[PDB]
Amino acid sequence: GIFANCIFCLKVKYLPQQQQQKLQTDIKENGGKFSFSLNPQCTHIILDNADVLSQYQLNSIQKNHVHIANPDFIWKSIREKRLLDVKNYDPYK
């Protein structure tokens, strides 16, 4: 699937539960994995609008080359059946 070899840290606790679950199944059904914790194996971190990252988390992200993206990155990649340009979905741009 389009998310093969992607490991997403999910920080989307302010989304409705149905959307959180749909994010998870969209990721799993398309070859990806997710965790709720940020670690060096994460390739991506998905961040809803209301969630924030500490300086520690930002330092880890930079160190491990983690891509910061909003939920639209997942939604739109699924909709277009193609992994999109994650750089177009960076809230911390």
Short mmCIF file of C-alpha atoms in Angstrom, two decimals:
data_model
loop_
_atom_site.label_atom_id
_atom_site.label_comp_id
_atom_site.label_asym_id
_atom_site.label_seq_id
_atom_site.Cartn_x
_atom_site.Cartn_y
_atom_site.Cartn_z
CA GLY A 1 0.00 0.00 0.00
CA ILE A 2 0.87 3.68 -0.32
CA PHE A 3 2.03 3.87 3.33
CA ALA A 4 4.40 0.88 3.15
CA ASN A 5 7.44 1.44 5.39
CA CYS A 6 5.75 4.47 7.00
CA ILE A 7 5.55 4.66 10.79
CA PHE A 8 3.24 7.43 11.97
CA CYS A 9 3.27 8.94 15.45
CA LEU A 10 -0.35 10.05 15.96
CA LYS A 11 -0.99 13.18 18.02
CA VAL A 12 -4.65 13.70 17.09
CA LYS A 13 -6.37 13.52 20.48
CA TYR A 14 -8.60 16.55 19.73
CA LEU A 15 -10.14 14.97 16.61
CA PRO A 16 -13.55 13.23 16.95
CA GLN A 17 -13.05 9.57 17.94
CA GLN A 18 -14.45 8.36 14.58
CA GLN A 19 -11.80 10.37 12.71
CA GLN A 20 -9.01 9.13 14.99
CA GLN A 21 -10.10 5.55 14.24
CA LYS A 22 -10.42 6.28 10.50
CA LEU A 23 -6.88 7.69 10.48
CA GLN A 24 -5.66 4.47 12.10
CA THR A 25 -7.48 2.11 9.71
CA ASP A 26 -6.50 4.22 6.67
CA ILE A 27 -2.88 3.84 7.78
CA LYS A 28 -3.10 0.09 8.58
CA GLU A 29 -5.20 -0.85 5.52
CA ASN A 30 -2.61 0.86 3.27
CA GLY A 31 0.54 -0.82 4.55
CA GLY A 32 1.57 1.63 7.29
CA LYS A 33 2.02 1.39 11.07
CA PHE A 34 1.21 3.90 13.81
CA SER A 35 2.12 4.62 17.42
CA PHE A 36 0.88 7.15 19.98
CA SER A 37 4.50 7.74 21.11
CA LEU A 38 7.26 9.62 19.29
CA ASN A 39 10.44 7.54 18.83
CA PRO A 40 13.45 7.29 16.43
CA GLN A 41 11.66 4.70 14.24
CA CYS A 42 8.81 7.13 13.43
CA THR A 43 8.96 8.37 9.81
CA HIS A 44 6.06 10.80 10.31
CA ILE A 45 4.17 12.60 13.04
CA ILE A 46 0.55 13.54 12.38
CA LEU A 47 -0.56 16.56 14.38
CA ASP A 48 -4.12 17.92 14.55
CA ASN A 49 -4.58 21.68 14.88
CA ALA A 50 -5.08 21.76 18.67
CA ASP A 51 -2.04 19.57 19.50
CA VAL A 52 1.38 21.17 20.13
CA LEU A 53 4.93 19.84 20.36
CA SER A 54 7.52 20.66 23.02
CA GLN A 55 11.03 21.82 22.09
CA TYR A 56 12.22 18.35 23.13
CA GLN A 57 9.84 16.72 20.63
CA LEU A 58 10.88 19.17 17.89
CA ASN A 59 14.56 18.37 18.60
CA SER A 60 13.85 14.62 18.33
CA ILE A 61 11.91 15.18 15.09
CA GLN A 62 14.84 17.08 13.54
CA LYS A 63 17.39 14.53 14.78
CA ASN A 64 15.51 11.53 13.34
CA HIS A 65 14.35 13.21 10.09
CA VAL A 66 10.68 12.79 11.05
CA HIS A 67 8.13 14.46 8.73
CA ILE A 68 5.57 16.67 10.52
CA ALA A 69 2.17 16.58 8.79
CA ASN A 70 -1.48 17.47 9.38
CA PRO A 71 -4.27 14.82 9.01
CA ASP A 72 -5.01 16.02 5.45
CA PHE A 73 -1.74 14.35 4.41
CA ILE A 74 -3.38 10.99 5.18
CA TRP A 75 -6.90 11.93 3.97
CA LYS A 76 -5.72 13.34 0.64
CA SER A 77 -3.13 10.61 -0.01
CA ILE A 78 -5.95 8.05 0.44
CA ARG A 79 -8.33 10.08 -1.74
CA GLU A 80 -5.77 10.39 -4.55
CA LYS A 81 -4.61 6.75 -4.09
CA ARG A 82 -1.05 8.04 -4.03
CA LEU A 83 1.43 9.12 -1.38
CA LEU A 84 1.50 12.94 -1.70
CA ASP A 85 4.23 15.47 -0.98
CA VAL A 86 4.40 15.59 2.81
CA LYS A 87 6.14 18.98 2.56
CA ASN A 88 2.78 20.49 1.49
CA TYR A 89 1.19 19.44 4.81
CA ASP A 90 3.66 20.71 7.42
CA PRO A 91 1.91 22.81 10.14
CA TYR A 92 5.30 23.88 11.52
CA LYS A 93 6.43 25.21 8.13
#
